[PDB]
Design a protein around this nucleic acid. Structure first.
Lengths: 129, 95, 31, 133
RNA sequence: GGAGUAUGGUCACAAGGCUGAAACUUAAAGGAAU
RNA sequence: GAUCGCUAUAAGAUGCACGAGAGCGAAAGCAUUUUCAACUGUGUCCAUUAAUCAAGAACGAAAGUUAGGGGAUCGAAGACGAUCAGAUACCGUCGUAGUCCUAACUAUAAACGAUGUCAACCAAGGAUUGGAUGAAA
RNA sequence: UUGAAAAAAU
Protein backbone atom coordinates (compact mmCIF):
# COMPACT_ATOMS: atom_id res chain seq x y z
CA UNK A 1 0.00 0.00 0.00
CA UNK A 2 1.50 3.31 -1.12
CA UNK A 3 -0.51 5.77 0.98
CA UNK A 4 -0.63 3.86 4.28
CA UNK A 5 2.47 5.75 5.49
CA UNK A 6 1.06 9.23 4.86
CA UNK A 7 0.06 11.73 7.54
CA UNK A 8 -1.76 15.03 7.08
CA UNK A 9 -1.17 18.40 8.72
CA UNK A 10 -2.72 21.89 8.73
CA UNK A 11 -1.42 25.39 8.05
CA UNK A 12 -8.55 32.42 7.03
CA UNK A 13 -5.71 27.79 8.07
CA UNK A 14 -5.94 27.48 4.29
CA UNK A 15 -5.32 23.79 3.59
CA UNK A 16 -3.57 20.54 4.40
CA UNK A 17 -0.18 19.11 3.43
CA UNK A 18 0.69 15.41 3.32
CA UNK A 19 3.89 14.10 4.88
CA UNK A 20 5.46 10.69 5.36
CA UNK A 21 5.03 9.40 8.89
CA UNK A 22 8.14 9.72 11.03
CA UNK A 23 10.67 6.89 11.13
CA UNK A 24 14.38 6.36 11.77
CA UNK A 25 8.46 15.71 10.31
CA UNK A 26 11.19 18.45 7.84
CA UNK A 27 8.16 20.70 7.37
CA UNK A 28 10.50 24.43 5.00
CA UNK A 29 7.56 23.87 2.68
CA UNK A 30 6.35 26.66 0.39
CA UNK A 31 2.61 27.04 -0.19
CA UNK A 32 1.24 29.25 -2.97
CA UNK A 33 -2.24 30.63 -2.28
CA UNK A 34 -4.48 33.26 -3.84
CA UNK A 35 -5.12 36.54 -2.06
CA UNK A 36 -8.81 36.13 -2.89
CA UNK A 37 -8.93 32.93 -0.85
CA UNK A 38 -7.05 34.49 2.07
CA UNK A 39 -9.31 37.55 2.27
CA UNK A 40 -12.46 35.70 1.06
CA UNK A 41 -13.05 38.54 -1.43
CA UNK A 42 -12.88 38.28 -5.22
CA UNK A 43 -11.54 41.84 -5.52
CA UNK A 44 -8.12 40.41 -4.57
CA UNK A 45 -8.25 37.56 -7.08
CA UNK A 46 -5.39 38.86 -9.22
CA UNK A 47 -2.63 37.99 -6.75
CA UNK A 48 -0.70 34.99 -5.47
CA UNK A 49 0.95 34.66 -2.07
CA UNK A 50 3.72 32.34 -0.90
CA UNK A 51 4.21 31.13 2.67
CA UNK A 52 7.12 29.16 4.11
CA UNK A 53 6.81 26.82 7.09
CA UNK A 54 7.61 34.78 2.20
CA UNK A 55 6.77 36.52 -1.07
CA UNK A 56 3.96 37.46 -3.43
CA UNK A 57 3.48 37.69 -7.18
CA UNK A 58 0.90 38.93 -9.66
CA UNK A 59 -1.00 36.15 -11.37
CA UNK A 60 0.12 35.25 -14.88
CA UNK A 61 -3.29 36.14 -16.34
CA UNK A 62 -3.28 39.72 -15.07
CA UNK A 63 0.30 40.54 -16.07
CA UNK A 64 -0.27 39.64 -19.73
CA UNK A 65 -3.67 41.34 -19.80
CA UNK A 66 -2.48 44.81 -18.78
CA UNK A 67 0.17 45.09 -21.51
CA UNK A 68 -1.09 47.37 -24.27
CA UNK A 69 0.42 47.68 -27.72
CA UNK A 70 0.78 51.45 -28.24
CA UNK A 71 2.09 52.78 -24.91
CA UNK A 72 5.27 52.80 -22.82
CA UNK A 73 6.08 50.23 -20.13
CA UNK A 74 7.85 51.45 -16.99
CA UNK A 75 9.47 49.06 -14.52
CA UNK A 76 11.65 49.50 -11.43
CA UNK A 77 12.80 47.82 -8.21
CA UNK A 78 9.80 45.15 -4.69
CA UNK A 79 8.88 45.24 -8.38
CA UNK A 80 6.62 47.93 -9.82
CA UNK A 81 5.09 48.28 -13.28
CA UNK A 82 3.26 51.04 -15.11
CA UNK A 83 1.97 52.16 -18.47
CA UNK A 84 1.45 55.59 -20.00
CA UNK A 85 -2.28 56.05 -20.54
CA UNK A 86 -4.45 57.75 -23.13
CA UNK A 87 -6.56 60.86 -22.51
CA UNK A 88 -10.23 61.68 -22.90
CA UNK A 89 -9.62 64.26 -25.64
CA UNK A 90 -6.57 62.49 -27.09
CA UNK A 91 -6.78 61.86 -30.83
CA UNK A 92 -3.39 60.47 -31.86
CA UNK A 93 -3.20 56.72 -31.43
CA UNK A 94 0.18 56.35 -29.71
CA UNK A 95 1.00 57.96 -26.36
CA UNK A 96 4.72 57.42 -25.78
CA UNK A 97 6.87 59.15 -23.18
CA UNK A 98 10.28 60.61 -23.86
CA UNK A 99 13.40 58.99 -22.45
CA UNK A 100 13.92 62.06 -20.28
CA UNK A 101 10.32 61.84 -19.06
CA UNK A 102 10.58 58.12 -18.27
CA UNK A 103 13.52 58.57 -15.90
CA UNK A 104 11.43 61.03 -13.87
CA UNK A 105 8.78 58.37 -13.16
CA UNK A 106 11.56 56.17 -11.78
CA UNK A 107 -2.69 46.58 0.08
CA UNK A 108 -3.46 51.23 -1.70
CA UNK A 109 -0.23 53.14 -5.88
CA UNK A 110 -1.89 56.55 -5.79
CA UNK A 111 2.55 56.81 -7.42
CA UNK A 112 -0.02 57.94 -9.98
CA UNK A 113 -0.27 61.39 -8.40
CA UNK A 114 3.55 61.25 -11.28
CA UNK A 115 0.41 62.57 -12.94
CA UNK A 116 2.32 65.86 -13.08
CA UNK A 117 4.84 64.14 -15.39
CA UNK A 118 2.69 61.88 -17.59
CA UNK A 119 -0.68 60.14 -17.76
CA UNK A 120 -0.55 56.73 -16.05
CA UNK A 121 -3.34 54.26 -15.35
CA UNK A 122 -2.08 50.68 -14.95
CA UNK A 123 0.10 50.77 -11.84
CA UNK A 124 0.68 47.52 -9.95
CA UNK A 125 3.20 45.82 -7.70
CA UNK A 126 3.92 42.60 -9.56
CA UNK A 127 6.36 40.91 -7.16
CA UNK A 128 7.95 41.04 -3.72
CA UNK A 129 10.97 38.92 -2.80
CA UNK B 1 10.96 43.41 -60.81
CA UNK B 2 9.99 45.21 -57.63
CA UNK B 3 6.99 43.35 -56.28
CA UNK B 4 6.74 45.73 -53.33
CA UNK B 5 7.68 49.34 -52.65
CA UNK B 6 8.75 48.60 -49.07
CA UNK B 7 10.36 45.32 -50.21
CA UNK B 8 7.98 43.39 -47.96
CA UNK B 9 9.45 44.67 -44.70
CA UNK B 10 8.43 47.66 -42.59
CA UNK B 11 11.89 49.17 -42.00
CA UNK B 12 12.61 52.64 -43.38
CA UNK B 13 15.26 54.65 -41.55
CA UNK B 14 17.41 51.94 -39.98
CA UNK B 15 19.98 49.46 -41.20
CA UNK B 16 19.51 46.37 -39.05
CA UNK B 17 16.91 44.72 -36.84
CA UNK B 18 17.07 41.73 -34.53
CA UNK B 19 15.89 38.37 -35.77
CA UNK B 20 12.98 36.48 -34.25
CA UNK B 21 11.79 32.90 -34.64
CA UNK B 22 8.90 31.72 -36.78
CA UNK B 23 6.32 30.22 -34.45
CA UNK B 24 5.75 27.10 -36.56
CA UNK B 25 9.20 26.54 -38.09
CA UNK B 26 11.80 28.25 -35.91
CA UNK B 27 13.28 30.02 -38.93
CA UNK B 28 15.26 33.18 -38.18
CA UNK B 29 13.24 36.07 -39.61
CA UNK B 30 13.85 39.81 -39.13
CA UNK B 31 11.64 41.53 -36.59
CA UNK B 32 10.16 44.02 -39.06
CA UNK B 33 9.59 41.47 -41.83
CA UNK B 34 7.83 38.99 -39.53
CA UNK B 35 4.11 38.36 -39.86
CA UNK B 36 2.78 39.44 -36.47
CA UNK B 37 -0.48 38.13 -35.03
CA UNK B 38 -1.95 38.56 -31.55
CA UNK B 39 -4.21 35.88 -30.07
CA UNK B 40 -6.48 36.19 -27.03
CA UNK B 41 -8.14 32.88 -26.16
CA UNK B 42 -10.02 31.53 -23.18
CA UNK B 43 -8.24 28.71 -21.39
CA UNK B 44 -11.56 26.83 -21.28
CA UNK B 45 -13.36 26.41 -24.59
CA UNK B 46 -17.06 27.10 -25.07
CA UNK B 47 -17.89 23.39 -25.14
CA UNK B 48 -16.57 22.92 -21.59
CA UNK B 49 -17.28 26.22 -19.79
CA UNK B 50 -20.68 24.84 -18.78
CA UNK B 51 -19.19 21.89 -16.90
CA UNK B 52 -16.49 24.00 -15.24
CA UNK B 53 -19.00 26.55 -13.96
CA UNK B 54 -21.36 23.73 -12.94
CA UNK B 55 -19.13 21.97 -10.39
CA UNK B 56 -16.95 24.93 -9.43
CA UNK B 57 -15.30 25.28 -6.03
CA UNK B 58 -15.51 29.10 -6.03
CA UNK B 59 -18.32 31.64 -5.80
CA UNK B 60 -17.87 34.20 -8.61
CA UNK B 61 -14.69 33.13 -10.38
CA UNK B 62 -14.11 34.92 -13.69
CA UNK B 63 -12.29 32.57 -16.05
CA UNK B 64 -9.03 33.92 -17.52
CA UNK B 65 -7.78 34.27 -21.08
CA UNK B 66 -4.38 33.68 -22.63
CA UNK B 67 -2.31 36.32 -24.43
CA UNK B 68 0.38 35.18 -26.86
CA UNK B 69 1.93 37.07 -29.77
CA UNK B 70 2.81 34.88 -32.76
CA UNK B 71 5.33 35.67 -35.49
CA UNK B 72 5.60 33.66 -38.71
CA UNK B 73 7.93 33.65 -41.65
CA UNK B 74 6.34 34.35 -45.01
CA UNK B 75 6.45 30.72 -46.16
CA UNK B 76 4.81 29.48 -42.97
CA UNK B 77 2.32 32.34 -43.02
CA UNK B 78 1.01 31.50 -46.49
CA UNK B 79 0.99 27.74 -45.92
CA UNK B 80 -0.70 28.18 -42.57
CA UNK B 81 -3.36 30.30 -44.31
CA UNK B 82 -2.59 33.21 -42.00
CA UNK B 83 -2.18 35.38 -45.11
CA UNK B 84 -3.06 34.81 -48.75
CA UNK B 85 -1.68 35.78 -52.15
CA UNK B 86 -3.76 38.85 -52.93
CA UNK B 87 -4.58 40.41 -56.28
CA UNK B 88 -2.05 42.67 -57.96
CA UNK B 89 -4.15 45.74 -57.18
CA UNK B 90 -5.19 44.38 -53.78
CA UNK B 91 -1.54 44.21 -52.71
CA UNK B 92 -1.50 47.94 -51.96
CA UNK B 93 -4.44 47.58 -49.56
CA UNK B 94 -3.13 47.90 -46.00
CA UNK B 95 -6.12 47.41 -43.72
CA UNK C 1 1.42 76.80 -54.51
CA UNK C 2 -1.12 76.50 -57.32
CA UNK C 3 -3.35 79.44 -56.37
CA UNK C 4 -1.01 82.30 -57.21
CA UNK C 5 -0.81 85.41 -55.02
CA UNK C 6 1.04 88.71 -55.25
CA UNK C 7 4.71 88.55 -54.25
CA UNK C 8 5.80 92.19 -54.29
CA UNK C 9 3.15 93.30 -51.76
CA UNK C 10 2.56 90.52 -49.22
CA UNK C 11 -0.41 90.79 -46.91
CA UNK C 12 0.13 92.03 -43.37
CA UNK C 13 -0.98 88.73 -41.84
CA UNK C 14 1.00 86.52 -44.23
CA UNK C 15 4.38 88.01 -43.34
CA UNK C 16 3.60 87.40 -39.66
CA UNK C 17 3.10 83.66 -40.24
CA UNK C 18 6.15 82.95 -42.39
CA UNK C 19 9.62 82.10 -41.12
CA UNK C 20 11.70 85.11 -40.13
CA UNK C 21 14.29 84.51 -42.86
CA UNK C 22 11.61 83.63 -45.43
CA UNK C 23 9.82 86.98 -45.29
CA UNK C 24 10.17 89.38 -48.21
CA UNK C 25 12.67 91.38 -46.14
CA UNK C 26 13.93 89.22 -43.24
CA UNK C 27 13.25 90.85 -39.87
CA UNK C 28 13.73 89.42 -36.37
CA UNK C 29 11.02 88.46 -33.89
CA UNK C 30 12.76 90.12 -30.93
CA UNK C 31 12.99 93.51 -29.24
CA UNK D 1 -13.56 1.34 4.54
CA UNK D 2 -11.41 4.42 5.14
CA UNK D 3 -8.07 3.90 3.41
CA UNK D 4 -5.05 4.64 5.63
CA UNK D 5 -3.54 7.98 4.68
CA UNK D 6 -6.87 9.34 3.42
CA UNK D 7 -8.75 12.34 4.79
CA UNK D 8 -12.03 14.20 4.33
CA UNK D 9 -12.58 16.63 1.46
CA UNK D 10 -9.47 18.62 0.61
CA UNK D 11 -7.88 20.78 -2.07
CA UNK D 12 -5.30 19.53 -4.54
CA UNK D 13 -3.46 21.11 -7.46
CA UNK D 14 -3.73 19.50 -10.90
CA UNK D 15 -0.82 20.23 -13.23
CA UNK D 16 -1.82 19.35 -16.79
CA UNK D 17 1.11 19.28 -19.23
CA UNK D 18 -0.16 18.70 -22.77
CA UNK D 19 2.34 18.73 -25.61
CA UNK D 20 1.60 17.42 -29.10
CA UNK D 21 3.37 14.15 -28.24
CA UNK D 22 1.95 13.32 -24.77
CA UNK D 23 -0.16 14.64 -21.89
CA UNK D 24 0.43 14.52 -18.13
CA UNK D 25 -2.31 14.62 -15.51
CA UNK D 26 -0.36 15.20 -12.29
CA UNK D 27 -2.08 16.12 -9.02
CA UNK D 28 -0.22 17.11 -5.85
CA UNK D 29 -1.18 18.67 -2.54
CA UNK D 30 -1.32 22.40 -1.85
CA UNK D 31 2.44 22.52 -1.22
CA UNK D 32 3.46 20.75 -4.42
CA UNK D 33 6.03 18.36 -2.94
CA UNK D 34 3.86 15.26 -2.36
CA UNK D 35 1.97 13.79 -5.31
CA UNK D 36 -1.34 11.95 -5.05
CA UNK D 37 -1.47 10.26 -8.47
CA UNK D 38 0.35 10.94 -11.74
CA UNK D 39 -1.01 9.34 -14.92
CA UNK D 40 0.17 10.23 -18.41
CA UNK D 41 -1.54 9.65 -21.72
CA UNK D 42 1.01 7.02 -22.68
CA UNK D 43 0.13 4.55 -19.94
CA UNK D 44 -3.39 4.28 -21.41
CA UNK D 45 -2.80 3.31 -25.06
CA UNK D 46 -0.59 1.04 -27.17
CA UNK D 47 0.17 2.98 -30.35
CA UNK D 48 2.73 5.75 -29.94
CA UNK D 49 0.67 8.15 -32.07
CA UNK D 50 -2.17 8.00 -29.51
CA UNK D 51 -0.04 9.11 -26.55
CA UNK D 52 -1.59 12.58 -26.90
CA UNK D 53 -5.04 11.91 -28.36
CA UNK D 54 -8.12 13.26 -26.55
CA UNK D 55 -9.33 9.75 -25.72
CA UNK D 56 -6.05 8.82 -24.03
CA UNK D 57 -5.95 12.17 -22.24
CA UNK D 58 -9.57 11.86 -21.11
CA UNK D 59 -9.20 8.23 -20.01
CA UNK D 60 -6.18 9.08 -17.87
CA UNK D 61 -8.19 11.96 -16.39
CA UNK D 62 -10.80 9.50 -15.11
CA UNK D 63 -8.52 7.29 -12.99
CA UNK D 64 -7.02 10.42 -11.43
CA UNK D 65 -10.50 11.39 -10.27
CA UNK D 66 -11.17 7.88 -8.96
CA UNK D 67 -7.96 7.81 -6.94
CA UNK D 68 -8.50 11.34 -5.62
CA UNK D 69 -12.02 10.57 -4.42
CA UNK D 70 -10.76 7.49 -2.56
CA UNK D 71 -7.96 9.48 -0.92
CA UNK D 72 -10.28 12.30 0.16
CA UNK D 73 -9.33 14.94 -2.41
CA UNK D 74 -12.50 16.41 -3.92
CA UNK D 75 -11.42 19.73 -5.49
CA UNK D 76 -8.39 20.65 -7.60
CA UNK D 77 -6.65 23.86 -8.59
CA UNK D 78 -5.90 23.48 -12.28
CA UNK D 79 -2.53 24.74 -13.57
CA UNK D 80 -2.48 24.32 -17.34
CA UNK D 81 0.80 24.30 -19.24
CA UNK D 82 2.25 23.36 -22.61
CA UNK D 83 5.77 22.85 -23.90
CA UNK D 84 6.33 26.58 -24.03
CA UNK D 85 9.98 26.94 -23.09
CA UNK D 86 11.17 28.30 -26.42
CA UNK D 87 8.92 26.05 -28.49
CA UNK D 88 5.18 26.35 -29.07
CA UNK D 89 3.37 27.82 -26.06
CA UNK D 90 0.15 26.18 -27.25
CA UNK D 91 -1.05 23.30 -25.03
CA UNK D 92 -1.79 20.22 -27.05
CA UNK D 93 -5.11 18.64 -27.99
CA UNK D 94 -5.44 16.76 -24.71
CA UNK D 95 -5.18 19.90 -22.60
CA UNK D 96 -8.91 20.63 -22.60
CA UNK D 97 -9.98 16.99 -22.83
CA UNK D 98 -8.40 16.10 -19.49
CA UNK D 99 -9.61 19.32 -17.87
CA UNK D 100 -13.24 18.72 -18.81
CA UNK D 101 -13.05 15.05 -17.84
CA UNK D 102 -11.96 16.08 -14.35
CA UNK D 103 -14.96 18.38 -13.89
CA UNK D 104 -17.22 15.81 -15.57
CA UNK D 105 -16.52 13.51 -12.59
CA UNK D 106 -18.21 15.74 -9.98
CA UNK D 107 -14.80 17.12 -8.98
CA UNK D 108 -14.97 20.77 -7.94
CA UNK D 109 -12.58 22.94 -9.96
CA UNK D 110 -10.90 25.78 -8.10
CA UNK D 111 -8.77 28.48 -9.67
CA UNK D 112 -7.50 27.85 -13.19
CA UNK D 113 -4.23 29.25 -14.48
CA UNK D 114 -1.84 29.03 -17.43
CA UNK D 115 1.70 28.48 -16.14
CA UNK D 116 3.36 27.80 -19.48
CA UNK D 117 6.94 29.04 -18.96
CA UNK D 118 7.30 32.28 -20.91
CA UNK D 119 11.02 33.05 -21.36
CA UNK D 120 12.12 36.56 -20.54
CA UNK D 121 15.31 36.27 -22.63
CA UNK D 122 16.03 32.76 -23.80
CA UNK D 123 18.75 30.65 -25.41
CA UNK D 124 18.91 29.50 -29.03
CA UNK D 125 16.10 27.43 -30.54
CA UNK D 126 16.59 24.09 -32.26
CA UNK D 127 16.40 24.10 -36.05
CA UNK D 128 18.89 26.58 -37.42
CA UNK D 129 18.52 29.64 -39.59
CA UNK D 130 16.22 27.96 -42.11
CA UNK D 131 13.85 26.33 -39.63
CA UNK D 132 12.49 22.81 -39.93
CA UNK D 133 11.99 22.12 -43.64
C1' G E 1 31.10 33.56 -73.02
C1' G E 2 36.48 32.73 -72.21
C1' A E 3 36.83 35.57 -66.82
C1' G E 4 37.73 38.50 -62.17
C1' U E 5 40.66 33.37 -65.46
C1' A E 6 46.39 33.49 -66.99
C1' U E 7 50.78 36.47 -66.08
C1' G E 8 53.29 40.80 -63.48
C1' G E 9 52.95 43.77 -58.77
C1' U E 10 51.44 44.25 -53.88
C1' C E 11 48.82 43.18 -48.94
C1' A E 12 47.90 38.78 -45.33
C1' C E 13 50.56 33.62 -40.90
C1' A E 14 46.57 31.42 -44.09
C1' A E 15 42.00 31.35 -46.64
C1' G E 16 42.23 35.00 -49.73
C1' G E 17 41.76 40.70 -51.24
C1' C E 18 43.16 44.64 -54.61
C1' U E 19 45.19 46.06 -59.82
C1' G E 20 43.99 42.64 -64.22
C1' A E 21 44.37 40.61 -70.03
C1' A E 22 44.68 37.61 -74.42
C1' A E 23 44.09 33.47 -77.81
C1' C E 24 39.68 31.28 -79.07
C1' U E 25 34.19 30.73 -79.61
C1' U E 26 29.15 32.33 -80.92
C1' A E 27 23.94 35.27 -83.31
C1' A E 28 22.30 36.32 -80.02
C1' A E 29 22.59 36.92 -74.22
C1' G E 30 19.36 40.00 -71.75
C1' G E 31 14.99 44.03 -69.62
C1' A E 32 9.58 45.28 -68.78
C1' A E 33 4.94 43.84 -70.07
C1' U E 34 0.69 40.85 -73.10
C1' G F 1 14.10 5.40 -9.98
C1' A F 2 13.62 8.39 -15.78
C1' U F 3 9.46 11.74 -17.87
C1' C F 4 6.64 14.96 -13.95
C1' G F 5 6.02 18.31 -9.25
C1' C F 6 7.78 21.78 -5.19
C1' U F 7 12.15 23.91 -2.96
C1' A F 8 17.53 25.92 -3.22
C1' U F 9 22.59 26.45 -5.68
C1' A F 10 26.92 28.18 -9.32
C1' A F 11 28.63 29.78 -13.79
C1' G F 12 27.56 30.65 -19.26
C1' A F 13 24.25 33.12 -22.61
C1' U F 14 20.23 36.05 -23.60
C1' G F 15 17.69 41.04 -23.07
C1' C F 16 10.35 38.63 -24.44
C1' A F 17 5.67 41.27 -24.02
C1' C F 18 6.38 47.39 -24.64
C1' G F 19 8.57 47.06 -30.20
C1' A F 20 5.87 50.62 -34.43
C1' G F 21 6.77 51.35 -42.44
C1' A F 22 9.03 54.91 -34.54
C1' G F 23 14.49 56.99 -32.84
C1' C F 24 19.95 57.44 -33.45
C1' G F 25 24.32 56.62 -36.47
C1' A F 26 29.19 58.10 -42.01
C1' A F 27 28.03 52.85 -43.29
C1' A F 28 28.52 48.11 -40.73
C1' G F 29 25.10 48.72 -36.60
C1' C F 30 22.54 50.08 -31.87
C1' A F 31 16.83 47.33 -26.95
C1' U F 32 17.42 45.22 -18.69
C1' U F 33 18.22 50.69 -15.21
C1' U F 34 21.53 53.73 -12.60
C1' U F 35 31.94 61.63 -24.44
C1' C F 36 29.91 63.22 -28.94
C1' A F 37 26.52 64.63 -32.57
C1' A F 38 22.15 67.03 -34.25
C1' C F 39 17.69 70.06 -34.42
C1' U F 40 15.31 74.53 -32.62
C1' G F 41 16.42 79.70 -30.34
C1' U F 42 19.73 84.04 -31.11
C1' G F 43 20.21 92.97 -32.97
C1' U F 44 26.63 87.08 -30.55
C1' C F 45 31.55 86.42 -33.35
C1' C F 46 34.93 85.46 -38.18
C1' A F 47 34.37 87.04 -43.10
C1' U F 48 34.75 83.05 -48.34
C1' U F 49 37.26 80.14 -44.56
C1' A F 50 33.24 76.48 -49.48
C1' A F 51 31.72 71.77 -52.84
C1' U F 52 33.67 67.39 -55.07
C1' C F 53 37.74 64.68 -54.74
C1' A F 54 43.37 60.47 -58.34
C1' A F 55 47.18 59.26 -54.29
C1' G F 56 46.64 58.29 -49.09
C1' A F 57 43.97 57.09 -44.33
C1' A F 58 40.24 55.61 -40.28
C1' C F 59 35.70 52.49 -39.30
C1' G F 60 33.78 48.03 -41.86
C1' A F 61 27.91 42.39 -40.45
C1' A F 62 28.77 36.98 -40.77
C1' A F 63 32.27 33.50 -41.50
C1' G F 64 37.49 32.52 -41.10
C1' U F 65 43.01 32.84 -38.50
C1' U F 66 46.39 33.06 -33.98
C1' A F 67 46.94 32.92 -28.23
C1' G F 68 44.52 32.86 -23.66
C1' G F 69 39.74 32.50 -20.60
C1' G F 70 34.81 30.49 -21.22
C1' G F 71 32.36 26.43 -22.73
C1' A F 72 24.71 26.79 -20.95
C1' U F 73 22.08 26.50 -25.74
C1' C F 74 22.54 25.49 -30.79
C1' G F 75 25.60 23.29 -34.15
C1' A F 76 29.91 23.29 -40.98
C1' A F 77 32.67 18.07 -39.89
C1' G F 78 31.09 13.35 -37.85
C1' A F 79 28.13 9.02 -35.74
C1' C F 80 23.64 6.52 -35.68
C1' G F 81 17.69 5.67 -36.99
C1' A F 82 14.28 6.47 -40.66
C1' U F 83 12.36 7.50 -46.28
C1' C F 84 13.97 5.97 -50.80
C1' A F 85 15.89 2.38 -56.48
C1' G F 86 20.06 4.88 -53.95
C1' A F 87 20.16 9.22 -49.59
C1' U F 88 26.75 10.33 -48.39
C1' A F 89 20.18 15.17 -48.14
C1' C F 90 15.57 17.39 -46.18
C1' C F 91 13.05 14.23 -41.03
C1' G F 92 14.76 12.41 -35.55
C1' U F 93 18.67 11.71 -31.88
C1' C F 94 23.93 12.54 -30.01
C1' G F 95 28.10 15.65 -31.05
C1' U F 96 34.11 18.15 -32.42
C1' A F 97 35.47 23.22 -34.47
C1' G F 98 32.42 27.20 -33.94
C1' U F 99 28.54 30.27 -31.42
C1' C F 100 30.66 34.33 -25.79
C1' C F 101 34.85 37.72 -23.75
C1' U F 102 39.96 39.75 -24.23
C1' A F 103 44.44 40.93 -27.74
C1' A F 104 46.21 40.88 -32.83
C1' C F 105 44.63 39.84 -37.97
C1' U F 106 41.30 39.51 -42.09
C1' A F 107 38.51 43.58 -45.29
C1' U F 108 34.64 40.78 -47.93
C1' A F 109 28.09 40.52 -48.34
C1' A F 110 21.50 40.49 -52.43
C1' A F 111 27.53 45.62 -47.56
C1' C F 112 20.46 47.20 -51.49
C1' G F 113 16.99 52.46 -51.86
C1' A F 114 20.34 47.14 -56.63
C1' U F 115 19.17 54.75 -56.96
C1' G F 116 27.09 58.86 -55.85
C1' U F 117 27.97 63.89 -53.16
C1' C F 118 26.47 69.21 -53.24
C1' A F 119 22.83 73.26 -54.93
C1' A F 120 18.10 75.92 -57.30
C1' C F 121 12.76 75.32 -58.76
C1' C F 122 8.65 72.10 -58.19
C1' A F 123 0.57 70.09 -57.88
C1' A F 124 -2.97 68.47 -53.96
C1' G F 125 -3.73 65.98 -48.95
C1' G F 126 -3.72 63.53 -44.28
C1' A F 127 -0.56 61.83 -40.45
C1' U F 128 4.05 61.39 -37.50
C1' U F 129 9.39 62.31 -34.42
C1' G F 130 12.04 67.02 -31.93
C1' G F 131 12.08 72.29 -30.94
C1' A F 132 10.19 77.35 -31.43
C1' U F 133 5.65 80.38 -31.39
C1' G F 134 -0.24 82.07 -30.26
C1' A F 135 -4.77 80.23 -28.04
C1' A F 136 -6.94 76.43 -25.30
C1' A F 137 -6.54 74.70 -17.80
C1' U G 1 4.58 10.73 -45.59
C1' U G 2 6.29 8.89 -50.97
C1' G G 3 5.49 11.23 -57.36
C1' A G 4 12.68 10.11 -61.05
C1' A G 5 12.83 10.52 -66.52
C1' A G 6 10.51 11.77 -71.87
C1' A G 7 16.56 11.65 -78.17
C1' A G 8 17.51 15.39 -83.15
C1' A G 9 15.20 18.27 -87.24
C1' U G 10 10.26 19.79 -88.93
Amino acid sequence: EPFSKKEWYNVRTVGQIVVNKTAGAQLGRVVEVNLADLMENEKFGAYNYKFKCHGLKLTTDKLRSIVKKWCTLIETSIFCIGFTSRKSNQIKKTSYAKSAQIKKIRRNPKIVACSKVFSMDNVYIRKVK
Amino acid sequence: TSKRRNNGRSKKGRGHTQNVRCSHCGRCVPKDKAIKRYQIKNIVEAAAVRDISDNSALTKYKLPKTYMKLEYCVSCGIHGRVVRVRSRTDRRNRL
Amino acid sequence: PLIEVDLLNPTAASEAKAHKMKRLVPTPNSY
Amino acid sequence: EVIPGSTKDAFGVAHIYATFNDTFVHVTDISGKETIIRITGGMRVKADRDESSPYAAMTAAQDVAKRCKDLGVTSLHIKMRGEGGVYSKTPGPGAQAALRALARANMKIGRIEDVTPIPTDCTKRKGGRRGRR
